[PDB]
Structures are given as C-alpha cells and as structure tokens.
Amino acid sequence: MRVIVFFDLPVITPENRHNYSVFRKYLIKSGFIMQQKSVYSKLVLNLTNRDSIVKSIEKNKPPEGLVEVLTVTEKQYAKMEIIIGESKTEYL
C-alpha cells in the first residue's frame, strides 16, 4: 500500500516555521518522499508497518496543526490526475 501524510501547520511566526521544518525533517528521516508541499508518501508492505509509521508520527507530531494519514493502493496512487499550471516541456 501507499501511505499519504498531508499536514496543515501554522507558518505565521518564526517558531511556527521552525516547527514546520522539524516535522518535515522527521518525515524525510522516516523515509517519506515529498509528493508536493505538505504532502508526503511512503510505500508500505503491510498494515503492521503502516500502523507503526502512524504511531511514530503521533509521537513526533508538531505542537500545533493538523496531520492526516491516508492509505491507498499503489494502483489508486498511480492513477492520480496531475494538473500543472504551466505544463509545457521546453528546454533552453
């Protein structure tokens, strides 16, 4: 399966942004890869590993904000629609 972690953390104050970078660094340290800003994903082979990942996220959560964890199949993830504001692939 694929685990998707999307979070909505405050970025107003310098402490907020420090706390944002700490949680992002924790996710990367856990082997998550960025899909887009505030959205990270990781392949999991079974749900036991899934629930260990979520338990670790809870123990390492930031002081404020919302963190949500979605689990999907790799096929569902592969059929995600990708929309880019400036799509064209021109090289300089």
């Binding site: 629930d51 979520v54 338990k55 809870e58 123990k59």
Partner: peptide
C-alpha cells in the same frame, strides 16, 4: 507514549 491508533 504507548500510542493506540
């Protein structure tokens, strides 16, 4: 700390 989730 003994997380249940």
């Amino acid at each position: 700390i003994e997380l249940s989730g």
